Structure 1
Amino acid sequence: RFSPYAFNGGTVLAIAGEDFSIVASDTRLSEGFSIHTRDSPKCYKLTDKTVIGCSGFHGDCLTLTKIIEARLKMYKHSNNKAMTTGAIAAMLSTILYSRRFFPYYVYNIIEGLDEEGKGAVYSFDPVGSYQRDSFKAGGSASAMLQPLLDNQVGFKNMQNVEHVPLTLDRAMRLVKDVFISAAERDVYTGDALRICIVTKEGIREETVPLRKD
């Protein structure tokens, strides 16, 4: 999508939806775009300890650099201190690495997905530019604004005159993973092949593949 200077094609669109107990981060599985699709497997998602899992998406080259870098940080906080790297500690940490990718320019958006010690389940967007914030609905990857809208209606439910929230259930999120990617396939066939759904309850990672026909 993004200009050649670290790319010639990468695609991959990710959606992630916050309930208030689980966060499922769904991404298409396949490594695509050049002019055709290169490969059918690749691990975008990595759990650094058991309590933080990052999934980085867009170019598979950026994803391989940034994820290993996210593993490195967990080792740095354990050695330096003695602790397990929580959600906040990782989210903040990603920004230091992200500083590098501002004169370089990227549209690879890495998303740390976990449970935070604030009483809820968390999905964090740091932008690939910099900045970090927490959110109730989010679209991240090669377009950071094409997945985003479906979640805006379904999760947030701020459609009165005013803004009042009302997160959805776990069962509603699973169906949201399966459906979104098929919808996005119509629009941009850069979400294709197989849908990989990762579920993070912030104390475990589980995976589900499903083929797309």
Structure 2
Amino acid sequence: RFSPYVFNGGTILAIAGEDFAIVASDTRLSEGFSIHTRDSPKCYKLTDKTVIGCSGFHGDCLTLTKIIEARLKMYKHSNNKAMTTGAIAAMLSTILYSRRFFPYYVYNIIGGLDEEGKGAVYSFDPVGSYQRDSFKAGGSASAMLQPLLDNQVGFKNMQNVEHVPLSLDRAMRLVKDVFISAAERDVYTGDALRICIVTKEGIREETVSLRKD
């Protein structure tokens, strides 16, 4: 019959550093076996220190982005200060549960700085749980990306491999390599890779292309 949902796909990555939060995402918006476009960035700049990415069903992503921006403006016009990261996480969990019985088909990843100046990535689920993790990969290429970050960032399952803190440009070559390697086998990985970096000095962006397949 009328089906209310459709899978647009997309791939969002996040890495929490010592003083930085890198969020990157492909820009292909597709449906089934077609391409609607090759430029649609999943990242969104909420505050000066918070970037959210939203993949899955696209209309719910747009709606959720606009509602989050509205409630940000409501918090600002009530309390003379911007929200934190964890405040946005709690509010988003309340929103994602507030349509429990007609759910959003949306994966959500919030990166940003905490109030101490440290990296914090809050993952989500379509129904409204969250947790403070160091790295997550959401969307269609999640399973192609989580074990490799477990290998490089988490240092899991290795022997006599010391724990080095993750630097910046090392994280950059990581993000570029994982998107190339995931774009080899995925059908939903875009061309344009939109990398957002949140530092203690503002928001940087960076556009790196891929193979045009």
Structure 2 CA distance for aligned equivalents of residues 137 and 12 of structure 1 = 6
1:75 deviates by 3.0
For the aligned residue pairs, the C-alpha RMSD in angstroms reads 6.6
Structure 1 residue 176: deviation in Å? 3.1
Structure 2 residue ranges without an equivalent (≥5) = none
Identify, as 1 or 2, the structure richer in strand. 2
Query: How far 1:46 moved relative to its partner?
Result: 4.2
> Are 1:29 and 1:40, in contact at CA under 8 Å, matched by a contact in 2?
yes
Deviation at 1:158, TM superposition (A): 5.6
Alpha-carbon deviation of 1:2? Answer: 16
2: CA distance, partners of 1:199 / 1:81? 19
Sort the Cα spacing of 1:41 and 1:131 in 2 relative to 1 into closer, same or farther, 3 A: closer
Distance 2:179 2:123 in 1: 20
Change (3 A) 1:7 1:211: closer
CA, structure 1 residues 200+131, in 2 after alignment: closer, same or farther (shift >3 Å)?
same
Cα distance in structure 2, aligned partners of 1:112 and 1:122:
9
Conserved 8 A contact 1:21-1:120: yes
4+ long deviations beyond 2 Å: 1-213
- 2-side partners of 1:2 and 1:167: how far apart? 49
Identity of aligned residues (%): 97
Question: Residues 21 and 121 of structure 2 are in contact (CA less than 8 Å); yes or no, is this contact kept in structure 1?
Answer: yes
Cα 1:24–1:162 shift into 2, 3 Å: same
Contact conserved, 1:21 with 1:121, CA < 8 A, in 2?
yes
Aligned with 1:131: secondary structure?
A: strand
Deviation at 1:194, TM superposition (A): 7.8
Alpha carbons of structure 1 residues 44 and 150: separation in structure 2 relative to 1, 3 Å: farther
Shift of 1:96: 6.1
TM-superposed CA distance for 1:5, in Å, is 2.7
Deviates more, 1:82-91 or 1:103-112: 82-91
Relative to structure 2, which stretch is displaced further, 166-175 or 136-145? Answer: 136-145
Residues 191 and 164 (structure 1), Cα distance of their counterparts in 2 relative to 1, 3 Å cut: same
> Against the structure 1 CA distance between its residues 143 and 212, is the aligned structure 2 distance closer, same or farther, given a 3 Å change threshold?
same
SS in 2 for 1:211: coil
The 3 A distance-change label for structure 1 pair 193 and 133 is closer
Distance 1:89 1:125 in 2: 12
Q: CA deviation at 1:18?
A: 7.3
* Cα drift, residue 61 of structure 1: 3.8
Shift of residue 106, structure 1, vs aligned partner: 4.0
SS at match of 2:143: coil
3-state DSSP class of the match of 2:152?
helix
For 2:56 and 2:116, the matched residues in 1 are separated by: 19
Query: 1:159 and 1:2 mapped to 2: Cα distance?
Result: 53
Post-superposition CA distance 1:91-146 (Å, at most 9, x none)? 87677667748855544555556675458899999985544544488888776966
Q: 1:143 to 1:86 in 2, by over 3 A?
A: same
Q: 1:198, CA displacement in angstroms?
A: 7.9
Alpha-carbon distance in 2 for matches of 1:191, 1:207: 10
Give the Å deviation of 1:23. Answer: 6.2
**Residue 180 of structure 1: how far off its partner (Å):** 3.8
2: distance between equivalents of 1:196 and 1:156?
26
Corresponding residue number in structure 2 for 1:33: 33
Aligned to 1:76: 76
Deviations 1:57-91 (A, max 9, x none): 97674575467457637735853778776777778
Change (3 A) 1:152 1:130: same
Partner-residue secondary structure (3-state), 2:210: strand
- Note if contact 1:91-1:112 (Cα within 8 Å) is conserved in structure 2: no
Gap change, CA 1:152 and 1:175, over 3 Å in 2: closer
Measured in 2, the distance between the counterparts of 1:178 and 1:24 equals 11
Shift of 1:184: 4.8
